[PDB]
Design a protein around this nucleic acid. Structure first.
Ligand code: QUI
Ligand code: QUI
Ligand code: QUI
Ligand code: QUI
Ligand code: MN
Ligand code: MN
Ligand code: MN
Lengths: 8, 8
DNA sequence: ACGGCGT
DNA sequence: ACGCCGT
């Protein structure tokens, strides 16, 4: 759920 | 995650 | 269920 | 010269 590199 | 030049 | 960078 | 995540 976090998007810091993927944003799932 | 660090932004020293890119800031991802 | 997910992965990324440039000055 | 630089490292981080939650629904
Ligand atoms: C988002 O909150 C989140 C939390 N845990 C994960 C585990 C694996 C893939 C993606 C995830 N996203
Ligand atoms: C994004 O691509 C990504 C990859 N690895 C991580 C590890 C810990 C927190 C955030 C991250 N983001
Ligand atoms: C941020 O903490 C971070 C860590 N590792 C990376 C590797 C590749 C591109 C971006 C990154 N960001
Ligand atoms: C920013 O553009 C950038 C490029 N290369 C690096 C290498 C090591 C630490 C920080 C960096 N920042
Ligand atoms: Mn990964
Ligand atoms: Mn580079
Ligand atoms: Mn977590």
């Amino acid at each position: 759920x976090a998007x810091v590199x993927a944003x799932v």
